Design a protein around this nucleic acid. Structure first.
Lengths: 49, 159, 185, 58, 51, 148, 222
RNA sequence: AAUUGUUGAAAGGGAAGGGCAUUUGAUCA
RNA sequence: AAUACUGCCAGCUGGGACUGAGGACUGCGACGUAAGUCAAGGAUGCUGGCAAUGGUUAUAUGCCGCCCGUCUUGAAACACGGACCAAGGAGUCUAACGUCUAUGCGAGUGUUUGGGUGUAAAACCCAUACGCGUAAUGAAAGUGAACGUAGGUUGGGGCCUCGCAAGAGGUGCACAAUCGACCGAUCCUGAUGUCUUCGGAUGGAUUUGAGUAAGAGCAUAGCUGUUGGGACCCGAAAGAU
RNA sequence: AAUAUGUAAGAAGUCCUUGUUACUUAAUUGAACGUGGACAUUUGAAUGAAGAGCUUUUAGUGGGCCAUUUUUGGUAAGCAG
RNA sequence: CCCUGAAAAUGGAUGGCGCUCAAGCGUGUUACCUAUACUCUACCGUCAGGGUUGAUAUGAUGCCCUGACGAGUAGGCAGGC
C-alpha cells in the first residue's frame, strides 16, 4: 500500500467508473459526418455564408 | 521492565580509583588543547558535568573545537555496517593526552635528523623501521658454566 | 574449492559498445575503437569511453559554456570536443571564433557559430584532422544539474527535494516541516 | 504461542558481507559546531588574505 | 602450448640454466670435501655421556 | 510487451516470482493509504514529511487569474525582439532611437534583474518591474515604462 | 625488405651476451652456496673441538602449505589465510621469518604445515611448479626472458636469480615472492605418514611446525 | 490417449518402474 | 676403516598405464669448427585384419536408488491433494506515476480539441490557445538571485610546454567537501524626505528554503515497482433491495 | 589475567621566513587560513589485494534449528531462554 | 581386565555371520583401498587481460591468444525453443 520514495498520487477511481467509460472511437467518423453536414448546409442555405 | 539509561552499568566504570578520591590535581587544567590534537577520553567521577557516555570511555579522538572549558572530540562509532562520526563536547577533566602521537613526532624528528646527517654523505640511510629479525649465530663457552643434568622430580603429596 | 575473497564471474561494471542501434553511432564507435587501439593518445580512449554514455550521462553543452572554457589562458587556439549535443544560449552576446566538434548540433548553436566565424565539424572530421587529439579540449556538461537527482538520497535533516506532484500550501508543509506542529524534519 | 525474542547471530556476517567502511575524510572538514566568534573571525581573515593575495599576485 | 618439466628434459634444463653443462662436466653434485680432522674436547666428550 | 514481460520467463516457477513463505495474497497493509500515523508512520515521517495537518488560512473561490504574473529575467530580454533586427539594434546604441519591447504583449507581467544586459539604450514596457532590474536598465541607459 | 637477417643476427648477439652474463652470475651463486655450507660445517666443527657449542642462527625462510579445507574455518584464521595466499588445500607459499610473520603463523597453525626449506627442494619447486604473475595471469616460467622482463628492475633476470632471492632473503625478497604464484601441490605420493593429519607433529600428525622435516613432505607432494 | 481383444517378442522365488558399465536377442549407415 | 640413519646428485638405467590437443615459418635452446641435425613454443614412421566397430531397444548381471507438489528448523511419512486420459485453466488491462534505457527536438517542447485535404477509422498539412520547463521563497500581503574572468582553496580525467624516457610547470570541463557572494521568510539597527506617521537606504545573524551562481527541459515507446480499480486464480460465517 | 577492543605508524607530513583577522593577548603575544622556500632510491612496521570509491532502482526476508566453549530458569529433558 | 551390584514386557541386534596367544582391549612401525578432495590433460560455458580494416574477404555484436572460475532454496538478470 505504502512503499519507498515514490510520489503521493490521488487517483479518483473508487465508484463504478467501469460503467461510465467513454472512448472516442468515432473521432474520424464524427469529423467526416461534420464535414458532410457542413457541405449539406452550405448547399441548402444558398450562396449565403 | 528493562533499564538502559545514560549511566547504566557504570558502577565500576564511573568510579574513582582506590585512595585517589577528592579533588583533581591541578595539571589537567594547565594542559593546552589545539585543533587536530589526538586525545584519549577517561571519565572522572568527581565532575558530573560534561561527562562522556559509556561507549566513549577509553576511545581516542581528534580535537576539532575549543571552548571556554571544554573541547570537541570526533569519535568513529560502528553502527550496523558503517562507521559514523560523532562530534561530542567534553570537559577538560575527562580528557588526557595520548603519548603515541608524541612518540610519532619524536620519531619524525629523529627521522629528519638522520635523513639530514646520513644523506650529507649519501649511504644507506634506511629510514624505515624493521620488525624483530631472527637472532644471528652465537657461540657459548662452558668456562665455569658446565651444563647441569636435570631430571623430573618424583611425585610428592605435600599438604 | 577456493575460499573466494571476491565475487566470481563478476562483470567489469562498465558499458562496452553502445546500447543504442544507431548505425552511424556504431560506425563512429568502431572508428574510435580502431584509433584508441592502434594509437597511444589517451584522448582517443576517453572519447571512445564517452561515446558509450547514456542520454542522462551526456548532458548538453552550451555555447556560453564553450566560450567560458575557451576564455582560459592558452585555450583560444584549441579545438573544442563535445561528446554529445551542443545547445544554443541566448544569454550570451559575443561568441569568439572557434572549432567545435560534436555528435549533434542544435540549429541555433550551429547558426551562432557560423555567424561568429567558426565551423561545426563531426567526430570523424576531428579524428581526421587530429588523429592523436592534438590541441583539443574536451567539454562535458553538468550531470548533477538534472531535476531527477535532487530527490536522490532523501532523509531526515537532509533537505533532498521530496517527491511531490503538486506545489504550494497544505502540500507536505504541515507537521514534520515546522516547529509549531511538533518536529522540524 | 511464544517466539524467539532477540538474537545477534549472523548479524556480524551480514554487516561484513558489505565490508564495514571508515568514513571518507577530506582536507577541509565540516565547520559546524565550531565557536561562532572563531568562525566569524576566520571568515574575516579569509576575506582579508584573499584580497591581499589578489592584490599581490595577478 | 604445453609446459615441459625441468629436471626431466635436458634441452629445457640447459635452456633455463646455462650453468647446467658446466655442472655436469665438473660433477659438482658429488664433490669430496677436505679431509680435515678435529677432536672434540674432553668437556664435551664427558657431557655427552654424563648421566 | 507480453513477449518481453517477465511472466513468460517466470512460467514454470511455482511462486511466479512472489516468494514461498509469503504468498502474493491480497492487500496486507491495507487499501490505498491505510495507515499514516500507526504503522506506516516511519516512512511517512522519513520520506513524506508534512502530510498531516493544516498550514495556512482559507481562500474561498481562489481564481488563478489575479496571480497571473509571469516572470522574465534580464538575460532573456533581447530574445523577444526579432533576430533580423536584434543585431541591428545591438550595433545601433543611441538614445534617440532604441528598440522597444512589449513584455505584456509577449506574455510576461514582471521583469527581474539577472543577466547583465549590454550597455545599450532600450525601452521596456511591463506591468511590474523590480528594483534591481530598473537600476540595471537605467545604468545601461534605458527607461522602464509602466503599462496596464 | 632484406633487413630480417640483420635483425636476426643482432638478436642472436644480444642473446649470447645475456647468456654469458647469466652463466657468470650462476657460477658466482654456486660458489657462494658451496662456500657458505662449508663455512657453517667447519664453524660447527671448531665450536665442538674448542669445548663449546655452536648456536646456529634461526632460519629466516619457511615454507607453509595448507592441509585443511575451506570449510569450518573461524573468520580471523580465514582472513589470515587469505592474506597469506592460502585459498586452496595443498597450496604452499614462502614466508620470511619476522615477529609479525611468526605471530601470523601461530594463529593458522592448526590448518597449515610449515617448516624450514632447503636449497634442493626450493629449486625443485621453482623448476617444476614455478608460475609467475603477469597482468594478473598465471603465465608459466619456461624462459629467463619473462623473469627478466617482469623483475629486471630489482636486479633479478633469471630463474636461478629468483631461486637465489628465495633462499637468501634480500632487499627484494618481498617482490620476488609476490611475483611467484602460490604453488599448487598434489597429495603426497608416499602418504602423509600419520593416521590422523589434524594432530600436532609432536602429537603424531601433519599439523604443526616440522622444521627440516618439511623437505621430505614437500618433495613427496611435488 | 485413458481402456480393451488377438497375433509376434521378452521377463516374472512376497511388487513393478530408474541411474552407473557390459554380455546376449532384435533392428539400424 | 667399514656399517646403520638422514639429506643431495644440473648421475645412469629397467618395466607399466592415461593422454595425441595445436596444423606452411616466426621464439627460446642444444649438437655440429662448418654444412646441416635435434628428445628444442602439443606424435610421427612402418605393418596387419575387415570393408566387424558402433547407434536404439528388451532381458540378464555387480552396485546404488523411498512418492510427485505444498506447509515446515525438520517430509517419504502413520500430515495434506492425486485411479487414469483428453479439452480449458490462472501477474491481464486502464489513469496518474518513480528509477533506468532508446528516439526526436531543444530553452524550448507536444499535429491529430479541431480545421483543410485525402486512394477514405489509413496517410499528409496547419493559425490562436493549452500541459510541463525556463524562479523561487513566505500562511498571506509581498519580494525576488554577478563586489569577482559568475568568487577563493584542495582533490581531479584531458589538453599545452619543457624534458631521451621517467619526470617538472600551466590551464584544468565533469564530480566530492569546505569557506564565500546574491534571492525569499524570521530576528535586528535605522539614510534623505514627510499627508507625524508613512516611507525601508545601508550594515548583521551558531536562524531558515523543495534557491541563483552560463538554463536542461518536453513528447513517445520499452523492463521493473506502487496506488486505485474485480486486479495472479478460486474460497467464507454475513448485510441490503 | 587470557581473549576481545580504540588510536598513531607521514607529502592532507615536517621544517625556515613572514601576509591577513572585527578572535585573543599588557604587547607581532598566541590560534586559524595563507604566500614563498627546503626534504621523491629506503614516501617513513610486516602481509595481502580478478582495483578502489560513489549514486539509483527493486524481487524475497522479518516463525528457525543444531554443533564446541561461557552461561540463566529448572532435579532432569530431543525443555525454555 | 574381568565378576556381583545390573530386573520389563512381538523375536534381534558391536549390522550380522562370527571371533578366545581374537576378528576384544592400550600403544609402537610399515604396506594396502577410496570423495563430485588434490596435480595434469581433453571439451563446454562465464569473467578478466589483449591482438586482429594494409586487402579481394563478408558476420569487428566476427575471428584468434593467455589466465582464472564453474554448488545452491526464495529471488534478480541475461541468452535461447
Amino acid at each position: 500500500a505504502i512503499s519507498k520514495n515514490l510520489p503521493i498520487l490521488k487517483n479518483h477511481f473508487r465508484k463504478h467508473w467501469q460503467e461510465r467509460v467513454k472512448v472516442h472511437f468515432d473521432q474520424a467518423g464524427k469529423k467526416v459526418s461534420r464535414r458532410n453536414a457542413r457541405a449539406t448546409r452550405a448547399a441548402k442555405i444558398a450562396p449565403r455564408p | 521492565g528493562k533499564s538502559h539509561g545514560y549511566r547504566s552499568r557504570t558502577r565500576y566504570m564511573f568510579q574513582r580509583d582506590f585512595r585517589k578520591h577528592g579533588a583533581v590535581h591541578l595539571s589537567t587544567y594547565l594542559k593546552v588543547y589545539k585543533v587536530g590534537d589526538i586525545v584519549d577520553i577517561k571519565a572522572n567521577g568527581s565532575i558530573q558535568k560534561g561527562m562522556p557516555h559509556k561507549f566513549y570511555q577509553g576511545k581516542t579522538g581528534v580535537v576539532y573545537n575549543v571552548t571556554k572549558s571544554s573541547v570537541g572530540v570526533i569519535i568513529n562509532k560502528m553502527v550496523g555496517n558503517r562507521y559514523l562520526e560523532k562530534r561530542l563536547n567534553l570537559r577538560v577533566e575527562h580528557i588526557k593526552h595520548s603519548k603515541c602521537r608524541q612518540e610519532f613526532l619524536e620519531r619524525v624528528k629523529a627521522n629528519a635528523a638522520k635523513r639530514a646527517e646520513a644523506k650529507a654523505q649519501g649511504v644507506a640511510v634506511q629510514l624505515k623501521r624493521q620488525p624483530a629479525q631472527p637472532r644471528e649465530s652465537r657461540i657459548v663457552s662452558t668456562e665455569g658454566n658446565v651444563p647441569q643434568t636435570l631430571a623430573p622430580v618424583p611425585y610428592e603429596t605435600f599438604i | 574449492g577456493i575460499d573466494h575473497t571476491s565475487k566470481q564471474h563478476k562483470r567489469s561494471g562498465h558499458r562496452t559498445a553502445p546500447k543504442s542501434d544507431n548505425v552511424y553511432l556504431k560506425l563512429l564507435v568502431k572508428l574510435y575503437t580502431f584509433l584508441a587501439r592502434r594509437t597511444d593518445a589517451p584522448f582517443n580512449k576517453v572519447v571512445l569511453k564517452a561515446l558509450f554514455l547514456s542520454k542522462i550521462n551526456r548532458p548538453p553543452v552550451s555555447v556560453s559554456r564553450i566560450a567560458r572554457a575557451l576564455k582560459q589562458e592558452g585555450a583560444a587556439n584549441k579545438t573544442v570536443v563535445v561528446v554529445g549535443t551542443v545547445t544554443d544560449d541566448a544569454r550570451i552576446f559575443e561568441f569568439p571564433k572557434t572549432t567545435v566538434a560534436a555528435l549533434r548540433f542544435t540549429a541555433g548553436a550551429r547558426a551562432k557559430i557560423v555567424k561568429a566565424g567558426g565551423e561545426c565539424i563531426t567526430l570523424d572530421q576531428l579524428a581526421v584532422r587530429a588523429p592523436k587529439g592534438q590541441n583539443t579540449l574536451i567539454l562535458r556538461g553538468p550531470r548533477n544539474s538534472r531535476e531527477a537527482v535532487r530527490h536522490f538520497g532523501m532523509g531526515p535533516h537532509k533537505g533532498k527535494a521530496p517527491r511531490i506532484l503538486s506545489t504550494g500550501r497544505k502540500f507536505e508543509r504541515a507537521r514534520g516541516r515546522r516547529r509549531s506542529k511538533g518536529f522540524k524534519v | 504461542a511464544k517466539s524467539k525474542n532477540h538474537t545477534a547471530h549472523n548479524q556480524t556476517r551480514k554487516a561484513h558481507r558489505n565490508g564495514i567502511k571508515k568514513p571518507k575524510t577530506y582536507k577541509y572538514p565540516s565547520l559546524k559546531g565550531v565557536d561562532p566568534k572563531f568562525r566569524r573571525n576566520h571568515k574575516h581573515a579569509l576575506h582579508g588574505t584573499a584580497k591581499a593575495l589578489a592584490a599581490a599576485k595577478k | 602450448v604445453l609446459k615441459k618439466n625441468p629436471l626431466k628434459n635436458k634441452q629445457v634444463l640447459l635452456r633455463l640454466n646455462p650453468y647446467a653443462k658446466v655442472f655436469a662436466a665438473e660433477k659438482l653434485g658429488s664433490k669430496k670435501a677436505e679431509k680435515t680432522g678435529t677432536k672434540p674436547a674432553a668437556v664435551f666428550t664427558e657431557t655427552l655421556k654424563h648421566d | 510487451p507480453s513477449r518481453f514481460t517477465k511472466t513468460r520467463k517466470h512460467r514454470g516457477h511455482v511462486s511466479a516470482g512472489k516468494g514461498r513463505i509469503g504468498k502474493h495474497r491480497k492487500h496486507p497493509g491495507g487499501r490505498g493509504m491505510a495507515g499514516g500515523q500507526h504503522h506506516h508512520r516511519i516512512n511517512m515521517d522519513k520520506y513524506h514529511p508534512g502530510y498531516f495537518g493544516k498550514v495556512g488560512m482559507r481562500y474561498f473561490h481562489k481564481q488563478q487569474a489575479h496571480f497571473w504574473k509571469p516572470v522574465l529575467n534580464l538575460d532573456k530580454l533581447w530574445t523577444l525582439i526579432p533576430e533580423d533586427k536584434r543585431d541591428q539594434y545591438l550595433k545601433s546604441a543611441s538614445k534617440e532611437t532604441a528598440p522597444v519591447i512589449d513584455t505584456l504583449a509577449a506574455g510576461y507581467g514582471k521583469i527581474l534583474g539577472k543577466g547583465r544586459i549590454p550597455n545599450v539604450p532600450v525601452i521596456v514596457k511591463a506591468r511590474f518591474v523590480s528594483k534591481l532590474a530598473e537600476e540595471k536598465i537605467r545604468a545601461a541607459g534605458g527607461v522602464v515604462e509602466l503599462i496596464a | 625488405a632484406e633487413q630480417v637477417a640483420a635483425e636476426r643476427a643482432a638478436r642472436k648477439a644480444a642473446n649470447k651476451e645475456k647468456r654469458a652474463i647469466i652463466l657468470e652470475r650462476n657460477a658466482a651463486y654456486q660458489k657462494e652456496y658451496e662456500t657458505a655450507e662449508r663455512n657453517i660445517i667447519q664453524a660447527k666443527r671448531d665450536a665442538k673441538a674448542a669445548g663449546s657449542y655452536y648456536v646456529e642462527a634461526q632460519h629466516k625462510l619457511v615454507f607453509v602449505v595448507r592441509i585443511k579445507g575451506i570449510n569450518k574455518i573461524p573468520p580471523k584464521p580465514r582472513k589470515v589465510l587469505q592474506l597469506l595466499r592460502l585459498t586452496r588445500i595443498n597450496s604452499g607459499t614462502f614466508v620470511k621469518v619476522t615477529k609479525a610473520t611468526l605471530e601470523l603463523l601461530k594463529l593458522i597453525e592448526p590448518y597449515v604445515a610449515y617448516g624450514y626449506p632447503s636449497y634442493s627442494t626450493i629449486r625443485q619447486l621453482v623448476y617444476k611448479r614455478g608460475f609467475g604473475k603477469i597482468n594478473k595471469q598465471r603465465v608459466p616460467l619456461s624462459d629467463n626472458a619473462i623473469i627478466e622482463a617482469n623483475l629486471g628492475k630489482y636486479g633479478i633476470l633469471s630463474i636461478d636469480d629468483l631461486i637465489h632471492e628465495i633462499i637468501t632473503v634480500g632487499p627484494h625478497f618481498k617482490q620476488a615472492n609476490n611475483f611467484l604464484w602460490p604453488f599448487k601441490l598434489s597429495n603426497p605420493s608416499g602418504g602423509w605418514g600419520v593416521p590422523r593429519k589434524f594432530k600436532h607433529f609432536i602429537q603424531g600428525g601433519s599439523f604443526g611446525n616440522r622444521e627440516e622435516f618439511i623437505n621430505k613432505l614437500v618433495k613427496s607432494m611435488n
